[PDB]
């Protein structure tokens, strides 16, 4: 019993974190086998961060311009290339701590753990979600670029996020591990703004199911709704549309609790209109949307 924002154990990722320095710029790198992955903005100069020409900047670099430090050990860079917004530094040593891993590009609404690091060393681990507007609501300071987000379902570390920048609203933007940004963002300090964010409806419903599984039913009601009527209401509260895919995805939690998906939708409609009137759900006084249907099953009985 209980329900917490639960991250994956971070040790498999901790053993991959390194510090990358180029000139006076330092950030974190991800050392897997004999490649160190890091944001290509490590090659920018403090002067030209509005319109860097990364191809031009990279061709002026030698392998020995990259200082890569794993703990107190300096790794020798023997090659380098750029893939989209990520730099790949080939090193002469394969990381003996490399876990089984893969790279995955996630969809908005998906969650993952973040190992926030500075100077190649971990500071903490927390759960995050890819927002509908392709930002993440992280906790990151200067020097955190190159920190990664990941899941570890079963034995395999799936890397899905590498941190690059902070937007003016204080939320974050970054790439997959192939260097493609999530969202319309670019690795430039030019003015960029996150679009309006919305609530991840299928996650809210998953979390209400977690509440019922943990023995709370006060917010259920006798009503059901249609999918289209629910979406008309949900939009008015800046909730994401619920698709038939989402309905299908909730099938398991629906079976475990005996509450049909569209019955739970009618309960969410009423919660949006009434609020919680001083009660809480799973210890929260607002509707939580960073637990996926899969997360709930992972955590609950």
């Amino acid at each position: 019993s209980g329900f917490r924002k639960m991250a994956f154990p971070s040790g498999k990722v901790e053993g991959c974190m390194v510090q990358v320095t180029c000139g006076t710029t330092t950030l974190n790198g991800l050392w897997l086998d004999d490649v160190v992955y890091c944001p290509r903005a490590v090659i920018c100069t403090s002067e030209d961060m509005l319109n860097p020409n990364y191809e031009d900047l990279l061709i002026r670099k030698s392998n020995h311009n990259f200082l890569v430090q794993a703990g107190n050990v300096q790794l020798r860079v023997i090659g380098h290339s750029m893939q989209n917004c990520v730099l790949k530094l080939k090193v002469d040593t394969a990381n003996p701590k490399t876990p089984k891993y893969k790279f995955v590009r996630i969809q908005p609404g998906q969650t993952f753990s973040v190992l926030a690091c500075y100077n190649g060393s971990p500071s903490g681990v927390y759960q995050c979600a890819m927002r509908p507007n392709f930002t993440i609501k992280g906790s990151f300071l200067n020097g955190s670029a190159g920190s990664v987000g990941f899941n570890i379902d079963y034995d395999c570390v799936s890397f899905c996020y590498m941190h690059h920048m902070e937007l003016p609203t204080g939320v974050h933007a970054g790439t997959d591990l192939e260097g493609n940004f999530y969202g319309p963002f670019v690795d430039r300090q030019t003015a960029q703004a996150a679009g309006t964010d919305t609530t991840i409806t299928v996650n809210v419903l998953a979390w209400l199911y977690a509440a019922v599984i943990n023995g709370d039913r006060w917010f259920l009601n006798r009503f059901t709704t249609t999918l289209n009527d629910f979406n008309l209401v949900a939009m008015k509260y800046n909730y994401e549309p619920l698709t038939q895919d989402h309905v299908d995805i909730l099938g398991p939690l629906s079976a475990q609790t005996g509450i049909a998906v569209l019955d739970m939708c009618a309960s969410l409609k009423e919660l949006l209109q009434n609020g919680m009137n001083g009660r809480t759900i799973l210890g929260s006084a607002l509707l939580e949307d960073e637990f996926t249907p899969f997360d709930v099953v992972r955590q609950c009985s």
Binding site: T26, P39, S46, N142, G143, A145, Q189
Partner: peptide, 8 residues
């Protein structure tokens, strides 16, 4: 107000 989060 967009900031790379490297450190310098």
């Amino acid at each position: 107000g967009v900031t790379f989060q490297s450190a310098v």
